[PDB]
Amino acid sequence: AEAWRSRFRERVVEAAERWESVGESLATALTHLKSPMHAGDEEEAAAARTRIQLAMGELVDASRNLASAMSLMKVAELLALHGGSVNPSTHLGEISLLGDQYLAERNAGIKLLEAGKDARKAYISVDGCRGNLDAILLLLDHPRVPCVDDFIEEELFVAGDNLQGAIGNAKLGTERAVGARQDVS
């Protein structure tokens, strides 16, 4: 009923920082993916590869900070499940079983559980976007393929769609994590 609650707050505070970093990296990645990419000239292909490598660097940052946010939020939940348990040998089965003396942590925990889902969906969508950008890199090395620029256009569209999905998940996840922070601050 004491120390774990501070640790819980610190983890929620740090999770919200990670989430805000994720949103910034995803947004910057998308700025690189707006205009068309072309393979039919070596200079245009090089321009496109550079844009892709910039986007990829932002997506690695986003993925890392998503992985950190998930870990932090999970540890916070477990702090509460163990900390809130009446018997020192056992942990609570789920956050909604927390006693009403820990209402702040219980309210925060409910948000962290859904933020966890938001983070996992964002992570998956980022990996999808990466997959599309990897496909474009393959297509840029086959300029003689008929219709190669149509295939690039297809993959670029899907990359943006996947990334826009992640952006939406991160918006919600960040909102939940800041809500959780507010619950315990």
Author numbering: 3 to 187
What wording appears in the published article?
We identified PBI1 (PUB44-INTERACTING 1), which belongs to a protein family with the DUF1110 domain. PBI1 interacts with WRKY45 and negatively regulates its activity. Therefore, it appears that PBI1 keeps WRKY45 in an inactive state in the absence of pathogen attack, and that PUB44-mediated degradation of PBI1 activates immunity via the de-suppression of WRKY45. PBI1 is degraded upon perception of chitin, and this is suppressed by silencing of PUB44 or expression of XopP, indicating that PBI1 degradation depends on PUB44.
